[PDB]
Amino acid sequence: GEELFTGVVPILVELDGDVNGHKFSVSGEGEGDATYGKLTLKFICTTGKLPVPWPTLVTTFVQCFSRYPDHMKRHDFFKSAMPEGYVQERTIFFKDDGNYKTRAEVKFEGDTLVNRIELKGIDFKEDGNILGHKLEYNYNSGNVYIMADKQKNGIKVNFKIRHNIEDGSVQLADHYQQNTPIGDGPVLLPDNHYLSCQSALSKDPNEKRDHMVLLEFVTAAGI
């Protein structure tokens, strides 16, 4: 897979969503440059106004673009599954609030690296930090824990995302994620490690639509 990520890859993201019966769609475009662990994307709510807060979707909107130091390449599960791809599934628990259930498929469409996702959210408080848009438009750095998952020929991934609430508090979002190759094809199984991540959300003064500009860097460590 390594050889597909050697340069600048166009990325395309498409999510269909239903949160507490609130329905929406988002398209994203950008490019990734795994060599530097860099992702640059722009997202647009195509169905109007985003019913949830943008920062809540970041995790959901391609770890194959993480930078795996030379010594760790053997642990890169993401790239290994390419081009056929991998399936990525999560449940993201918002403390004292609802949950998101996501199913995505990450693979190449020719030259393009695509992420197609179905997202379902239930149990959200209509007056919650989420439904009530109480989260700051920003994003914290942190770690993503990776571990091999044999009886599935995949990996298990766990982490906590802390969204800042505008009152100064925090909205914890606990992530439980599973990935498995799309094919019958081989993949690399990693030893435990983690991805060190950081992100910055911005806006395009020109875009009138509901959107998010995202700049992100992630580098595998712990080995």
Side-chain angles (χ1 to χ4, degrees), residues 63 78 88-90 144-147 149 155 157-159 175-177 179 195:
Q63 311 157 308
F78 310 99
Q88 169 163 311
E89 287 162 282
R90 313 206 175 92
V144 165
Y145 303 94
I146 306 177
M147 109 166 84
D149 157 56
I155 56 182
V157 180
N158 312 272
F159 58 105
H175 300 58
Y176 300 83
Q177 153 189 357
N179 305 81
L195 300 177

Side-chain angles (χ1 to χ4, degrees), residues 67-72 74-79:
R67 172 166 77 86
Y68 271 77
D70 182 85
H71 62 291
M72 306 206 238
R74 96 167 182 257
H75 298 274
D76 200 337
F77 159 95
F78 310 99
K79 288 196 198 53

Side-chain angles (χ1 to χ4, degrees), residues 104-106 108-117 119 121-126 128-149 153-155 157-177 179-207 209-219:
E105 289 195 37
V106 181
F108 281 79
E109 293 283 2
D111 263 18
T112 303
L113 185 285
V114 180
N115 184 13
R116 283 169 214 164
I117 310 135
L119 174 163
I122 65 173
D123 304 327
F124 280 104
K125 344 199 122 141
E126 301 276 343
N129 281 334
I130 296 111
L131 287 193
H133 300 263
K134 311 176 153 157
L135 316 183
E136 259 137 16
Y137 188 64
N138 59 32
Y139 215 86
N140 295 325
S141 316
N143 298 150
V144 165
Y145 303 94
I146 306 177
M147 109 166 84
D149 157 56
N153 169 23
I155 56 182
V157 180
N158 312 272
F159 58 105
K160 246 152 215 104
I161 284 308
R162 272 104 181 205
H163 307 285
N164 275 197
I165 306 142
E166 335 152 294
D167 63 2
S169 202
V170 166
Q171 170 63 75
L172 184 61
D174 261 302
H175 300 58
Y176 300 83
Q177 153 189 357
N179 305 81
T180 50
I182 269 179
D184 260 328
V187 310
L188 294 165
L189 276 255
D191 285 342
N192 288 37
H193 65 300
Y194 63 96
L195 300 177
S196 162
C197 328
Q198 66 191 286
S199 324
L201 309 195
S202 70
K203 247 88 142 103
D204 140 49
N206 317 241
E207 185 57 44
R209 287 167 299 175
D210 209 352
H211 65 295
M212 168 176 76
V213 173
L214 162 80
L215 173 74
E216 181 180 337
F217 300 87
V218 185
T219 305

Side-chain angles (χ1 to χ4, degrees), residues 11-15 26-29 41 43 61-62 113 115 117:
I11 303 153
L12 164 55
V13 178
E14 315 279 355
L15 170 152
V26 179
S27 301
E29 315 181 354
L41 284 113
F43 302 86
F61 299 135
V62 295
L113 185 285
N115 184 13
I117 310 135

